[PDB]
Write a protein that binds this ligand. Structure first.
Ligand SMILES: Cc1cc2nc3c(=O)[nH]c(=O)nc-3n(C[C@H](O)[C@H](O)[C@H](O)COP(=O)(O)O)c2cc1C
Ligand SMILES: Cc1cc2nc3c(=O)[nH]c(=O)nc-3n(C[C@H](O)[C@H](O)[C@H](O)COP(=O)(O)O)c2cc1C
Ligand SMILES: [Cl-]
Ligand SMILES: [Cl-]
Lengths: 339, 339
């Protein structure tokens, strides 16, 4: 038996009662007990029952359109007892509870949960996934894994920061991060960090083609954006270069009780970064290693760009990543445009 | 009138908890402070309301109390119209001793969300924790151009250490290095912003020039003590660092999309500090910084000019940062030891 807890965000009061009625019916049939609280636009649900049976329900609740931003906070895998043996699904509306002695607990709960939701927006997606799976991020051991590492950043970003107002730079950076995160995630990748204007992400060794396609789609969407906007919009000057590496990296949660983070340790991270920087002096906006190339099964036109020093290593690209522009001219054009 | 909420962990008894309750009633009666103290599973929740001078005066007293630790103020309300608890000088509730069944769901939800909250706090940038502690929602703060000293430190010959050490040995070594850097940076008023691979990124204000140099020297010194504290079979015996400091304008604030948010620092100084840390590999000093950092220093260091490096930039260090070893020889030692 196992018991899990999740919180969610509500997307009218009668419909909630309908939910509760359905749950009472469905859960008694499956020996599932639990509770549904709601307060100030948030849902709280505890569910317990047979391991297989709770999972089917949770999948239904996940795809349910009535709530969004679902996060499973805790899972307990071999519970000796149930917490609510008699409740198929007790609905408790903490909004219309006016009892004074419950008001401090209720107020603290709302404050702490809202604060928790704010913090969730800064978490690495890999930690959120771990928590959703019932794994303690603080105790899980890091592992060596084979990964494709993705690095991209904004062309001539120092020139742009030098010549643009604060809000313009932030709007531009936010648009860039938005387009990178959306495309990376669409292809199954995971964004690791933003470092300045750099986007760091990782794909699995089975996602070589997806990484190439992510890189091409980001470049392609930037080119569209550049001719979507007027020439007074800074977005008209947004270009990117992309580096990809493949290797062994130690993935996990690192640090101390004072400060934690999710990190990838290994040479491939630095190689991807150097390759991304190398695209400035290349006729292509995407550079990757032989290891990345070997993870690809599609019929790309790989182009060998010789050995370069980051030891020297072979550097490849695909034909479709070729620049329709000259890079040095572009940075000068950016400089002159901002005069 | 001011109302604030905070949570804390108990350091290190029912009669002692009730003694806290009685002292608070007396003092709060004196200063027209009302509120609620709540205890649950080694955790403290307290709500305090009153006029500004008195609640701050009490809060400073509460921070220094040795009975609780890891104090975080979650919300602050200013010039409030009403009191939330007009009639309670200090109502102490021990939810551990509450056996009521109807309260058990809310009590369980509070414990779970608070414990998850404390875990999430560890992953936050120190600037976000700071903003929350000031009763400011970090998500509503607008980015600002500010003058910052940027700090970068990483592990020497880390590529060799990852290649030749087991995963668990690498993790113990990186955790200890992160543990040491975070403690010292934080002790000196610096803010750790994130870990990138084996690198620690932090920022200091322009008024903390000496504190940043002292932070760097202290980390180096503590690594030196540790290297001779341990046996030669311990990976910690081979742990060295290089440190880079830069000074310049950076944009600070929340950036990204609905898919991924983060606290980022945008600016030329971020890249410069990273390159200077890497530059220490080929210098007889473990610390390298720009001229702007040197101008932020009021203490009488022996600054040493290491010329210009790559537009070129001028590099400085302090005589105190000199290595008692040759760096190439130390790298060869690291590889020869691991055979
Ligand atoms: C917040 C929330 C909690 C829910 N909890 C339960 C639950 O505990 N048990 C249950 O059977 N259904 C629950 N539901 C939704 C129903 O599973 C779903 O609407 C219905 O069962 C679909 O019926 P079907 O299986 O015939 O498609 C919940 C929905 C929401 C939005
Ligand atoms: C969790 C916790 C909550 C506390 N709350 C209050 C409080 O609300 N009011 C108060 O005067 N002291 C509170 N105290 C303790 C104060 O520091 C107290 O005034 C101190 O222990 C004794 O003060 P005194 O030396 O001036 O007599 C609290 C302590 C703890 C650990
Ligand atoms: Cl693929
Ligand atoms: Cl990382």
């Amino acid at each position: 038996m196992k018991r899990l807890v999740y919180i969610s965000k509500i997307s009218s009061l009668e419909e909630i009662q309908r939910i509760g009625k359905v749950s009472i019916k469905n859960n008694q049939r499956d020996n599932i007990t639990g509770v549904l609280l709601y307060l100030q636009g948030l849902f709280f649900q505890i569910l317990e029952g047979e391991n297989e049976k709770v999972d089917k329900l949770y999948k239904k609740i996940l795809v349910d359109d009535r709530h969004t931003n679902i996060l499973c906070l805790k899972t307990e895998y071999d519970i000796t007892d149930r917490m609510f043996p008699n409740w198929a699904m007790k609905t408790i509306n903490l909004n219309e509870n006016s009892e004074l002695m419950i008001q401090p607990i209720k107020s603290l709960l709302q404050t702490i949960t809202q604060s928790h939701r704010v913090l969730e927006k800064y978490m690495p997606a890999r930690v959120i996934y771990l928590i959703n799976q019932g794994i303690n991020p603080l105790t899980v051991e890091p592992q060596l894994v084979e990964k494709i590492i993705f690095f991209s950043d904004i062309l001539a970003f120092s020139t742009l920061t030098e010549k643009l107002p604060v809000n313009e730079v932030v709007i531009l950076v936010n648009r860039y991060f938005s387009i990178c995160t959306r495309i990376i995630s669409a292809y199954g990748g995971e964004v690791t960090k933003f470092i300045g204007d750099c986007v760091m992400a990782s794909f699995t060794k089975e996602q070589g083609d997806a990484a190439i396609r992510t890189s091409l789609d980001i470049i392609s969407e930037l080119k569209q954006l550049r001719h979507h906007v007027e020439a007074t919009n800074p977005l008209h000057l947004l270009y990117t270069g992309i580096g990809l590496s493949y290797g062994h990296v130690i993935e996990g949660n690192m640090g101390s009780s004072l400060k934690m983070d999710h990190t990838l340790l290994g040479d491939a991270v630095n190689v991807a970064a150097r390759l991304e920087a190398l695209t400035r002096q290349l006729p292509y906006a995407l550079a990757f290693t032989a290891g990345v190339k070997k993870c690809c099964q599609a019929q790309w036109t790989f182009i060998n760009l010789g050995a370069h020093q980051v030891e020297a290593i072979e550097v490849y690209t695909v034909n479709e990543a070729q620049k329709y522009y000259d890079t040095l001219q572009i940075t000068q054009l950016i400089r002159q445009t901002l005069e």
